[PDB]
Amino acid sequence: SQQVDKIKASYPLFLDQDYKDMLAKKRDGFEEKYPQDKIDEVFQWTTTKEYQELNFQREALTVNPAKACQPLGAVLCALGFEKTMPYVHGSQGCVAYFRSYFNRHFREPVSCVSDSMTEDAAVFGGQQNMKDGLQNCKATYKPDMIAVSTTCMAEVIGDDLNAFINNSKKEGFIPDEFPVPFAHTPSFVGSHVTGWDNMFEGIARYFTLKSMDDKVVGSNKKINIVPGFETYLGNFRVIKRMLSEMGVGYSLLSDPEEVLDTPADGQFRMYAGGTTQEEMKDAPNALNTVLLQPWHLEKTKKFVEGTWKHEVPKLNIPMGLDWTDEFLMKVSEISGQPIPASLTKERGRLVDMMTDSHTWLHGKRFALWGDPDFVMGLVKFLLELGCEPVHILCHNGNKRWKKAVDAILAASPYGKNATVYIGKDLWHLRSLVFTDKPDFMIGNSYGKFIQRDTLHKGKEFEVPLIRIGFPIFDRHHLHRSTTLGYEGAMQILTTLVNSILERLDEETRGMQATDYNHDLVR
Amino acid sequence: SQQVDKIKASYPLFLDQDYKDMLAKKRDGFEEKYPQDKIDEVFQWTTTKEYQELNFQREALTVNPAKACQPLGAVLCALGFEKTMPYVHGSQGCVAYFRSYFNRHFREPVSCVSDSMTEDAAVFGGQQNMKDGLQNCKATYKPDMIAVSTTCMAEVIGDDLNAFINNSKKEGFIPDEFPVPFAHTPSFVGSHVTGWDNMFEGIARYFTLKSMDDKVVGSNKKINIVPGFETYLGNFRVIKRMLSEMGVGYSLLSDPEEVLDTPADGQFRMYAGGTTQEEMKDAPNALNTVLLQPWHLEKTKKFVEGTWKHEVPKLNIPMGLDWTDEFLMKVSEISGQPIPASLTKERGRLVDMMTDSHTWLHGKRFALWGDPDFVMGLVKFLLELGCEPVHILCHNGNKRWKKAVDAILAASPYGKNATVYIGKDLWHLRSLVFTDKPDFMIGNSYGKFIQRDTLHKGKEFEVPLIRIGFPIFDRHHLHRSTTLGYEGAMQILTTLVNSILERLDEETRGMQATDYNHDLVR
Amino acid sequence: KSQPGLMTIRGCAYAGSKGVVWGPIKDMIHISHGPVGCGQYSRAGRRNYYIGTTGVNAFVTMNFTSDFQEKDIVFGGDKKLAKLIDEVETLFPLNKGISVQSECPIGLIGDDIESVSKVKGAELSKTIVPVRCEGFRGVSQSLGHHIANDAVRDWVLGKRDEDTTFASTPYDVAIIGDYNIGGDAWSSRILLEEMGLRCVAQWSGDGSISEIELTPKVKLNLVHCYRSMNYISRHMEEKYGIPWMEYNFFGPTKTIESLRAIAAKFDESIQKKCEEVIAKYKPEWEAVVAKYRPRLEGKRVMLYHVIGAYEDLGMEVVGTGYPDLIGSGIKEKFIFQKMGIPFREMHSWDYSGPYHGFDGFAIFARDMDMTLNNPCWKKLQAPWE
Amino acid sequence: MSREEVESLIQEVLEVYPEKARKDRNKHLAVNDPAVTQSKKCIISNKKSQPGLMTIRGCAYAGSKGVVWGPIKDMIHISHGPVGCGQYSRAGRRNYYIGTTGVNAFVTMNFTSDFQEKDIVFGGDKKLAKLIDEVETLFPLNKGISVQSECPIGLIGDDIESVSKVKGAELSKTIVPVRCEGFRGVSQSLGHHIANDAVRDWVLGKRDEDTTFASTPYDVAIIGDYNIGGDAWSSRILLEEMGLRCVAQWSGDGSISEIELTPKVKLNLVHCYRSMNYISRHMEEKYGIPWMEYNFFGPTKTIESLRAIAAKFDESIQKKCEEVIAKYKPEWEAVVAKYRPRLEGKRVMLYIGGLRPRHVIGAYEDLGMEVVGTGYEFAHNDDYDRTMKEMGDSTLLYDDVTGYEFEEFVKRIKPDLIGSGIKEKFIFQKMGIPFREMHSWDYSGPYHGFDGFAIFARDMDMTLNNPCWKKLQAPWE
């Protein structure tokens, strides 16, 4: 039943008595459900240490991964260039999933095309698919560039991207001068961030490999900034703002900020902003190239150091206080511009906030996950705040990155209880937070289920989730946030301290039970 | 008892068995506590409509007021001027309370002095107190200006501020040219915002009344912006940023943003930034004066229109979409500058966020309180979002302001179930949210207790509090937020929609009971 | 086939099989066999509602995968699949069956998932369903539906053919093709069981493998999604002689008509119960129409089964595919939002719902009035432009 | 560090003042001599503040409503006058209580007369009677009403005593008028005195002829403990594990009933001498009840106070005291072993109101910390007599210190930690010096007793050794 004045959606409509009776009869008559005592026993077993050993003995089964496949990162990288059309050579369902994923995260239109390779292409390849797709895509969506990645089927059948593009240009499907950079993005190697690296390196190779004769390092008095796989618009904004404050000439290569934040004014813009082709062509002339996320831009670093001859600085991600300081000092050294008083005042205000919130932030325990650079920056920032990142999970991290994070943890007294897990998924982390319960989790929306599981064990066992990372699906407009620089550090500190304060308020809201600690002033 | 590995603070230390037994023994043996059945009966009665009628029949008792006294707003206004010491003629307890209040809201030092009027001055007046205090303050804290307000003691005694300042200057306690603007701030008239208006009018009159012979309107090609009683630093910043983007000369009179956000860099700054005396002197030369919060700047508006001859534009607070739009059109008309593409893009992005979150924001009911302009801006924004501000409460609002808010509600289909309450306090609002339960409340930290009360009735009766307004004591660094302009509307919208989504997540986190609606995507 | 490089909404065979058909089976564990991407992008993407303890006896919103790497591509993943099945048995003992949904590389590397499934199922006495649903097969999710239906037929439907212990009643019906998006199948089931009928089976939405096995015991098969289940309905008619009929619970007129049509297949007691249910629900949807039709009368709708509710609210559907409003997916939602037209997702019901039935009609009308008459759509052009 | 250096520092700090202010403020700064008993020959206190010098003192209303009367949970306390005084003092003090707020407890609530101009011009006695009627109507489970006067009440000639008499007689309710106008006295100290006199004259003698309370030889009353963060509960659990019966608590988590039962106790354990010595002396002279001061800050003071209290009773209480001390020795020994190596040798400067500047020194010394400067907002000369022997030689003492004076002393002495109120916290935090709130315990606590000592050590270590203090200087500056 429904009431017209108060219409109930599925919650709490399905909590009504008739629906409960119908569901109970369905379950007891036809579902053959296990007894509720058996379900409770199995759940309690899954929350135990022995189940944790069984879970960590896994070698072939992945449950709830914390990563995606390369072409998603390749598409995100391609979206960062001016009037550039992402094009995945292979199966269409991959492109549908990529567009849906980015649509749900950014709440924005996401442009990506596929050449719709079918069973026939499993025999003679997708050469005809490449020709028809390039021709039709250029004719219909009129991009200045088409950036080509691959699906897993194309990598398995061994499609040669370069030869297919050359034949498409030779047979007149597309003009020979039309820029079509490509990158092989095998979805069974690495993850989405690897795809971002591959796509960016392919585009840089396309525009700069054959034009190095006239290039002189530091002739346009600019610094190249390579952001990497980045799903916070505020991060691009803060890097650009901090560089402009310093008066430092910069080129943000693969900037998707404009196309991921198109205003609603009555018209749909397929393309907006982004790195121009002239910027990519002039990139070797810069003083240097700074990689914002060095741990998934290895191929890009190799190309920039080996072709552009840029001495890429060994910089951490500009996350937290110390690493933002190092980034600003290195930018000052490269460009010669002194750090302005505005940035010094912003740093002092961040330090003021840390000082104000340190009592509530001290000793708190966190289980966190995400991409390597973001995770390591979060670990550094938590160590700066006196927090304890007990469970550090990076499904797409490697041994060298784990070594770096362990070195970071060893330098701080708050990294004593920390452990880094590479190759593990969110089921491993669910076991970890059941057996060694932290105060909070930090991660994407997929962690919301872990919290639910903890709440099933008991309110005292519940580990609340803080949504920093990618993807965030169950909250709106969190992609607009910042995690880089002093501004990102301030936002993250505010989020952490206020999450602690909401949790304390919830725990002390019981009148005559716990409300003696329901302080007005905190 | 405590374990040194996990030391418990009061929560949850006092939940231990021995503390529970000790508290039970104390209550049963010596407190003569009412029976728990009687207590529950009385609470349930307080949640009813009959109790609401009794509560709203109040005429002499005020319970949990939603306003402060004039000298607090006067001190805030004085804080917005360069090297200006707030000086309250009267008793020192008021100054201690003002400084503590602003310290807890801003988490920053707040400088203010008193002349320590003692009962020996309760008969003869505070002339000697005024002379000694002015001399001591100027000698010790070296301000370029001393801005004088009064406590209720001095107002009741009838101390003559003008004559006392003149006698202090005449007797050589302070130099004749030293600026000592003053204002009478009776704490029994109006509220803190009235004190801000009185202090600003005193300073403007001091610096301009005797020098209007050479003033020409529009000669400096600037616009005076009067913020009023403002406790969000982001509001000052957003006004300055929007005016700078438009290429509009402006003079933010009483800008306390710098002094309330000093960096923590090893030194203490008593004074920082603020409106200069040259700016205040040249203010009559401006094209016009725009009041950000006209409903508590009546005296300032009267003075500006009658003395500076500025045709003050009839403008609402620049809150929400339409009112920010109107503010930008009026500023463009006054200054002649067109509205740049960046502000148009920001408006379009705010509209985009509105269209993204309208499904979750539509039909939600809110009980809100605060200062008059803040709450009318909040009501207008909620109407723009499709929300229903069912309970609008303004302890320091008047009848004409209520007429304005009712007119605002009448223009919208979503203001049909909305009621405006002036002269009512938070106990009235508690009865309102019990008898006519909204989805959320919007207000200061004082609302948290209301939420606790609602939670005592039941989880299905709990009304969550969204902390927007002044003061916010139980959360950190929310004073850095923005509520004005497109950016302020963005922040408010993000907070509202994520509050709704967090509440929905909490309601549907019950495993096998409500988690059928625990969607990953929302 | 789809034209290359034109930007299709269309999914793949894996999305049709795992995402649509097999996934909502709550007590079964579904393995996305292959690289991580397909499993990760489809995890909890569809709102096929269910009742259970996720991770213990229900696994719908979880993502199990083989996480194929280069070594698995080069040397095959059959040994990996067998080890994965052993680990699934070890860590999820209350799973009542395993499905192995193939991704694109599985077919191309010559993996024999059928032999692995047969061997492991014989060893563990468990039903393991190999589904050859590689994404490159076919041109859309339709072949995914077909392959999933063939897998259901070959591996699940007929394992209780000999079984007779089930006590069948003359009023046994099975709901087929209703995936319980936002609780739609529950809202249909409440009406059907209010009619005196007994929904023995309801798959895939909130579906059990046991009731899939009980489907050949029902007297009538009520098919909502004809496209994804016509194959199994036809096979069940040919093999078990069970009549299958289509129904529509979208909008009060359509659900009244469907209830009468379904009751006409049974005796007069069911028809009397149908009349009682229709009379009982008449005031509710009548009041909903009275409230919301004036707000939505004379409004044109474009879309890309549901026309009945739109017309019952006073709307006019002037566009459909496989204006004052557009109803489509998430990939077109923001594109149409930026051109300024109110939009509704007709795949997840904009995370609202349910929409089927008399209860769902109130939610549907509220949502249409909410989105179409939202003030955000009148605030598109800046007042200075 | 040396006495001559401290005196020279005092002189150069005083150099900025005008003549009258410098002459007055010279008498309130001193170099501690622990061998001096009469501090009147060394320091001067309980005098009016110098005008316009950023004093930290509150008012008499703060000392009465905010300190003594407010913590009483079953009583409703009316801030009589305009809205400011009640609004700024609402829930700002963490005097913890157990109850149902709004029904039978009203501590965190703000009741006020909300004086307007008409109430100033024509008086508010009629408004006060109407307010009492409204309070009775809307809060039936209150056990009494107190009327704390704000500044205008005394000046406009209001007679709250007559209204309290009439309404109490009519409603059979204990209505206590308190003339605690802010302009009275020089600080919160006169507020304490006025509140104590009000308690004596309106509450304490209610059950003088009542003999229905079964009294035991072990009846004690805790006086001057306002349960800041639960401190009174941490003291009470220790006292009751010792075999004593805590009949009353003054006034944190205190009820009017146990205040009325205080004349029946055998001993008065006074924690805050400054705020409740008046009522302790009155109870001694009227009911013959002995009173003794006790300190529960840190294990050393806690053990010494427990033994001193147990020495007032039979040998069974002494045996139970030894049992409690033996029980709690491992806990605070582990706390010390964990935290003292982190805090050993660190110098602390304190400036709190009237008792804690000397009471918390033992707890700090239990962790190896040294207090180099202490001072009071509103203490009297007896408090300084007690303080001088507690502080070390040649340490700094300040009475009613100014903001400028405190800043200059901190800049010169450069302590490792400062413990003061919210008005100094951010000043000294921007200066790079770790700060602890010694009024509200930085929203932590309790600090009394052994559990309180564990919390105190954790907080001191967490703030003093926080990494944020190594980051105030930009690496490029």
Ligand code: ICS
């Ligand atoms: S199965 Fe089909 S796309 Fe018939 S693949 Fe798709 S839950 Fe749609 S129009 Mo999403 S043929 Fe169902 C469908 Fe319809 S996932 Fe749902 S809404 S009624």
Ligand code: ICS
């Ligand atoms: S009552 Fe006094 S100022 Fe003795 S007015 Fe003050 S809760 Fe202080 S040093 Mo705030 S004489 Fe208590 C005090 Fe001490 S409010 Fe608390 S901390 S032990």
Ligand code: CLF
């Ligand atoms: S059409 Fe369908 S969704 Fe596409 S791959 Fe093929 S089965 Fe799968 Fe998979 S990991 Fe990523 S998303 Fe692909 S490139 Fe491969």
Ligand code: CLF
């Ligand atoms: S010394 Fe003390 S706190 Fe001051 S007034 Fe007097 S009793 Fe009160 Fe009150 S309303 Fe505001 S804060 Fe004052 S100016 Fe009057």
Ligand SMILES: [Fe+3]
């Ligand atoms: Fe959007």
Ligand SMILES: [Fe+3]
């Ligand atoms: Fe601060």
